[PDB]
């Protein structure tokens, strides 16, 4: 948008005291990410900068009441959120407000926290023999530990050796600990460092096709940490075994317990293991002096199954800290809303958990873990009233918060609310602007709005 207009007199080089409308010029097909700009000058190198000055500002989402003229030109405007007078003229859809009290909007504070406070976590899944065992398994044969009804809390795995992969295929790591499956199997084994990439759905690799075959649609996780500190024996580490020779590839999640001889030629061997007859089993070589690609890595995968059975394994719960004397979002396992949590003296029964009233609304809940009766009450709210003596008289206004003690939003407390913007005088005049409870406001004298 743009608009060109001259000046009327020699200004002090400030923004003029006038109103002007801006018309659109161009609507180029753009939309690239733009967050920073810069203005170019015109240096007259006879280097001279000349004389320039701009008033770059920032735009904000606001509502405006635009006045159109008989010819379609914008003449006036209201900010609708700057001062209570502008809000009154905005909600009245006019520009010359009369003398009296007007309700503009409703005062209401916003919550601060988002506490949950879910119940405790009792049933812990068995993860002490699959992440802390001495020797998990070999590569030619792997183990499988069926897990039962529990809540799979993967946050406890932070105590392992750092710098370990946690690439979860299918599922999302952010939403990982909210998932009710039916069964989860753990397959742990130890391989080299250059074979961690081979453990993936459908990827080329000798160990990925002759030892362990992961399916292409595998939706689980894979964990592999460095084991060079404890699984590296300098005196001939050969306790691990991995297959290298086989007739064909393995099926997804297949157990190759066959130990038959391998034949790369055409002559019968019949169990000799000599020339042209090799043994399809080779042992690793783990030495603390080898490179990272040769260090041992305990790889454990978690296959997740999904059936229409009673969900045995699920995810843990947050159970955040509880805050009192502040309107926050309460999520006590059965409700979602706003309210102030305060200690209540209402004695409940051992089987009761919620609480109603005459209005049929929740007003007291029992904490899940630490049994204690609370008192849910909505935050402070009311009606914002603006006392205006009229635009033709002045522009000073007074705000009246109906039913608010104006302690958590001159200030004077009345029985009808709280008036902020008018002083209370001890005199007694005729009522000009009715407020309530015998309080009246007037624009008298140093002119200002007074209450009496």
């Amino acid at each position: 948008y743009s608009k060109h207009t001259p000046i009327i007199v020699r200004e002090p080089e400030d923004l003029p005291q006038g109103f002007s409308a801006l018309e659109p010029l161009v609507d180029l097909p753009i939309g690239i990410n733009i967050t920073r700009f810069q203005t170019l000058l015109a240096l007259h190198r006879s280097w001279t900068a000349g004389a320039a000055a701009y008033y770059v500002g920032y735009l904000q989402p606001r509502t405006f009441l635009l006045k159109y003229n008989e010819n379609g030109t914008i003449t006036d405007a209201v900010d609708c959120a700057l001062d209570p007078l502008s809000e009154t003229k905005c909600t009245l859809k006019s520009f010359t407000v009369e003398k009296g009290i007007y309700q503009t909007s409703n005062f209401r504070v916003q919550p601060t926290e988002s506490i949950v406070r879910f119940p405790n976590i009792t049933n812990l899944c068995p993860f002490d023999e699959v992440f802390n065992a001495t020797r998990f398994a070999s590569v030619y044969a792997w183990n499988r530990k069926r897990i039962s009804n529990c809540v799979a809390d993967y946050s406890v795995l932070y105590n392992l050796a750092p710098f370990f992969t946690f690439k979860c295929y299918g599922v999302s790591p952010t939403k990982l600990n909210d998932l009710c499956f039916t069964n989860v199997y753990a397959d742990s084994f130890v391989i080299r460092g250059d074979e961690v990439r081979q453990i993936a759905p459908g990827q080329t690799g000798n160990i990925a096709d002759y030892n362990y075959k992961l399916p292409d649609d595998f939706t689980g996780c894979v964990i592999a940490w460095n084991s060079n500190k404890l699984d590296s024996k300098v005196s001939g580490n050969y306790n691990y075994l991995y297959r290298l020779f086989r007739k064909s590839n393995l099926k997804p999640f297949e157990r190759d317990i066959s130990t038959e001889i391998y034949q790369a030629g055409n002559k019968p061997c019949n169990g000799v293991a000599g020339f042209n007859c090799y043994f399809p089993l080779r042992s690793y070589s783990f030495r603390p002096t080898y490179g990272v690609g040769h260090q041992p890595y305990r790889v454990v995968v978690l296959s997740f199954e999904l059936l229409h059975a009673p969900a045995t394994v699920c995810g843990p719960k947050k159970s955040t800290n509880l805050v009192k004397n502040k309107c926050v979002n309460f999520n006590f396992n059965g409700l979602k809303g706003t309210g102030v949590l305060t200690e209540s003296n209402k004695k409940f029964l051992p089987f009761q958990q919620f609480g109603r009233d005459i209005a049929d609304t929740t007003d007291a809940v029992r904490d899940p873990q630490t049994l204690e009766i609370l008192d849910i009450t909505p935050c402070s709210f009311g009606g914002v009233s603006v006392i205006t003596p009229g635009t033709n008289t002045s522009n000073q206004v007074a705000v009246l918060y109906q039913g608010v003690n104006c302690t958590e939003v001159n200030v004077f407390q009345t029985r009808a609310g709280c008036l902020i913007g008018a002083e209370y005088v001890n005199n007694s005049y005729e009522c000009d602007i009715p407020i309530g409870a015998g309080i009246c406001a007037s624009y008298q004298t140093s002119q200002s709005i007074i209450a009496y």
């Epitope: 398994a137 183990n143 130990t259 169990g271």
Partner: nanobody, 118 residues
Framework: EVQLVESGGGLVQPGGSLRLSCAAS????????MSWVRQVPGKTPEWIGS???????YINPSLKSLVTISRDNSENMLYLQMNSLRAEDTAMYYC????????????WGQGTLVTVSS
């Protein structure tokens, strides 16, 4: 419910051999994988032999053509004959049926006292 394994041992006999044999009780042993693991203080894991069901065995690349294992089923007792006894062989040998790729229902014995020192 019963091990009935690791019955034997030896004394300091340099330049000789070990006739250590560990039997097995009558049970449902079909896919068993017997092996020998030392228990020298400082080096807990150790692999010596193998008992694959197909009859073939695997020897470690270190002691190539040094340890010989033979299967015997006359009185249900496995044999093991090795030669060229070193001086650092002081350890506690075991006959474990649940070798690597196990540790879920793994069980061990009591230990065969075998030590040599020149």
């Amino acid at each position: 419910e019963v091990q009935l394994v690791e019955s034997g041992g030896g004394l300091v006999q340099p330049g000789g051999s070990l006739r250590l044999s560990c039997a097995a009780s009558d049970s449902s042993f079909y896919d068993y994988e017997m092996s020998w693991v030392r228990q020298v203080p400082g080096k807990t894991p150790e692999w010596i032999g193998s008992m694959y069901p197909s009859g073939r065995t695997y020897i470690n690349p270190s002691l190539k053509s040094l340890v010989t294992i033979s299967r015997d089923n006359s009185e249900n007792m496995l044999y093991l004959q090795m030669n060229s006894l070193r001086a650092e062989d002081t350890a506690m040998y075991y006959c474990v049926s649940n070798w690597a790729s196990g540790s879920t229902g793994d069980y061990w014995g009591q230990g065969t006292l075998v030590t040599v020192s020149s």
